[PDB]
Amino acid sequence: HKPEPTDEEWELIKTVTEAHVATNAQGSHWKQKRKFLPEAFSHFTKIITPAITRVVDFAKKLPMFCELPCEDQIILLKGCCMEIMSLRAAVRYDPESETLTLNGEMAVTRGQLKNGGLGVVSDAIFDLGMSLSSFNLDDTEVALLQAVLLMSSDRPGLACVERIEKYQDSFLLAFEHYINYRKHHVTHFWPKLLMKVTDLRMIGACHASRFLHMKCPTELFPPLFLEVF
Amino acid sequence: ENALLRYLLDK
Numbered sequence: 315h316k317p318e319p320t321d322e323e324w325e326l327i328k329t330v331t332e333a334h335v336a337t338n339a340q341g342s343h344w345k346q347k348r349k350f351l352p353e354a355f356s357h358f359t360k361i362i363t364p365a366i367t368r369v370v371d372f373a374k375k376l377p378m379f380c381e382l383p384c385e386d387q388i389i390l391l392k393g394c395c396m397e398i399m400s401l402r403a404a405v406r407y408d409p410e411s412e413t414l415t416l417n418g419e420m421a422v423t424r425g426q427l428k429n430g431g432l433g434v435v436s437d438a439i440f441d442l443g444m445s446l447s448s449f450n451l452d453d454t455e456v457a458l459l460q461a462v463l464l465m466s467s468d469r470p471g472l473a474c475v476e477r478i479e480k481y482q483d484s485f486l487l488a489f490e491h492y493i494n495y496r497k498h499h500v501t502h503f504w505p506k507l508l509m510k511v512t513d514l515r516m517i518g519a520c521h522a523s524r525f526l527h528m529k530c531p532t533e534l535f536p537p538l539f540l541e542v543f
Numbered sequence: 544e545n546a547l548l549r550y551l552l553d554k
């Protein structure tokens with residue numbers, strides 16, 4: 315009964331899904347190439363830059379993103395980068411080892427990510443990972459969640475606010491219609507998914523708080539990390 | 544600023 319995706323929505327789903335799969339670290343081989351961190355600014359310093367770069371590559375493969383002016387692209391990436399990386403770690407939550415996987419390789423514990431420098435944001439990302447188990451999100455659902463965070467019109471300083479809001483509405487309709495098609499065995503699935511979008515948005519602004527607190531002189535922070543704050 | 548971000552985007 316509930317509306318299933320249109321042809322134009324299936325094309326948008328193909329584009330965004332493939333863009334995610336092509337920029338998701340060790341997509342197939344993440345669980346079998348996992349190295350469990352011993353027992354960490356150092357080891358988390360090394361892996362942040364490639365994680366930002368993958369998010370940049372994801373956005374650069376969305377045609378709608380590429381039609382925006384450079385200064386809007388910069389602001390949109392600043393806004394969603396930690397949100398998208400957090401989501402990507404959270405969907406790689408292993409409930410048996412109670413680890414997240416970063417960069418497809420590094421499995422970390424709640425304690426390691428917390429004392430590694432993230433602080434209470436570590437607890438938020440792990441708690442999101444635990445909640446996202448029973449949601450059983452596929453590559454397409456993760457990609458659309460990412461497109462929705464990327465196309466956020468309330469980022470300060472944005473020029474094409476109206477265009478970005480229009481792009482987001484396309485993704486949200488495609489996303490809801492895919493969720494109808496997918497028929498998850500969870501009640502109020504779509505309302506509950508939008509609450510997760512808020513959880514990632516809260517994680518994005520707490521990263522920004524923790525960042526200002528972590529300032530250690532600035533030259534210790536990797537250059538690209540400083541740019542996306 | 545944002546020189547490195549700018550570079551990675553315009554590639």
Ligand SMILES: CCOc1nc(C(=O)NCC(=O)O)c(O)c2ccc(Oc3c(C)cc(C(=O)c4cc(F)cc(OC)c4)cc3C)cc12
Pocket residue numbers: 338339355358359360361362365368396398399400401402403404415416417418430431432439528530533534535536539
């Ligand atoms: C899941 C939360 O977001 C994150 N996600 C991923 C990731 O790969 N996600 C999965 C995927 O993309 O597939 C990462 O790799 C992450 C690495 C580090 C990280 O948080 C730090 C930490 C822990 C340290 C520094 C630093 O480089 C630093 C430098 C200093 F000079 C001082 C300092 O003070 C603590 C910290 C900088 C960041 C972003 C957060 C990550």
